[PDB]
Write a protein that binds this ligand. Structure first.
Ligand code: CAC
Ligand code: CA
Ligand code: CA
Length: 205
C-alpha cells in the first residue's frame, strides 16, 4: 500500500520516520521521492542515513541559506533542484562509486550531473535510515534547524542506476513505474514518530 504521504507540519527535533529496513553495501544507487514544501530559505532534510563512525553516510539536505546538497560519506555535491514552491515535485539522484559520478533529475528531467563525489567508496551497510531529520548520532542527534518541513511520498531506493526512461516513468506515474528493490514505499515499511502524520496520496492527480 503505497498511496500515502507523510506530512511534517512544523520545524522540530522530534518528528521523523524511521525506515524499518537498512541498506546493503551499495556500489551504485538511485534514491527518488515526491516532495512538497513551502519552507524557506531551505526545506531541510528529506532523509539521512547514518552508520557507525559516519552519521552523514548518505544525506539530502537544504539547510538555511545554503543550496540543496547530497552528502555521501560527509562529502558534498550541490544539486540543481528548486522544489520549495509549494507544489509537488519528483526528484531522483543516481550515483556510482565509479569515479563518483552522479546525475540529478527533477520532475522526470535530468538537470544536473557531476563527478568526484565520494569516489571509490561504496555506501556502507547496516545503518539507520531516517526521513525528515538529519542525524548526528546513529539514529538520532536531530537538529530542528535542519528538519524537513513539508510532505513526502514514494520514497524509494534501488542499488543500481535507473535509466532516464525509468525516472520518466516514476515522474509521470506510469503503470510501468518501478518500486525500489532496496527501499520501497509502503506503510508497513516505516515507523512514524513525534507528530509526523500519514495522509492519502494520489500521485500525478
Ligand atoms: C554539520 As551536520 C550537516 O552533520 O549537522
Ligand atoms: Ca550530521
Ligand atoms: Ca546535524
Amino acid at each position: 500500500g503505497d498511496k500515502f504521504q507523510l506530512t511534517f507540519p512544523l520545524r522540530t527535533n522530534y518528528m521523523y520516520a524511521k525506515v524499518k529496513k537498512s541498506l546493503p553495501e551499495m556500489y551504485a544507487f538511485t534514491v527518488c521521492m515526491w516532495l512538497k514544501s513551502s519552507a524557506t530559505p531551505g526545506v531541510g532534510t528529506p532523509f539521512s542515513y547514518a552508520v557507525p563512525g559516519q552519521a552523514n553516510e548518505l544525506v539530502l539536505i537544504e539547510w538555511g541559506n545554503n543550496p540543496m546538497e547530497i552528502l555521501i560519506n560527509d562529502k558534498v555535491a550541490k544539486l540543481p533542484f528548486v522544489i520549495n514552491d509549494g507544489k509537488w515535485h519528483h526528484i531522483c539522484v543516481t550515483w556510482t562509486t565509479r569515479d563518483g559520478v552522479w546525475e540529478a533529475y527533477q520532475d522526470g528531467t535530468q538537470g544536473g550531473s557531476g563527478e568526484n563525489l565520494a569516489p571509490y567508496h561504496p555506501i556502507k551497510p547496516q545503518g539507520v535510515l531516517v526521513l525528515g531529520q538529519e542525524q548526528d548520532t546513529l539514529g538520532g542527534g536531530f537538529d530542528a534547524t535542519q528538519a524537513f518541513v513539508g510532505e513526502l511520498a514514494h520514497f524509494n531506493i534501488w542499488d543500481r542506476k535507473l535509466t532516464p526512461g525509468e525516472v520518466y516513468n516514476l515522474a509521470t506515474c506510469s503503470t510501468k513505474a518501478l518500486s525500489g528493490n532496496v527501499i520501497a514505499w509502503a506503510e508497513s515499511h516505516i515507523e512514524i514518530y513525534g507528530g509526523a502524520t500519514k495522509w492519502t496520496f494520489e500521485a500525478c492527480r
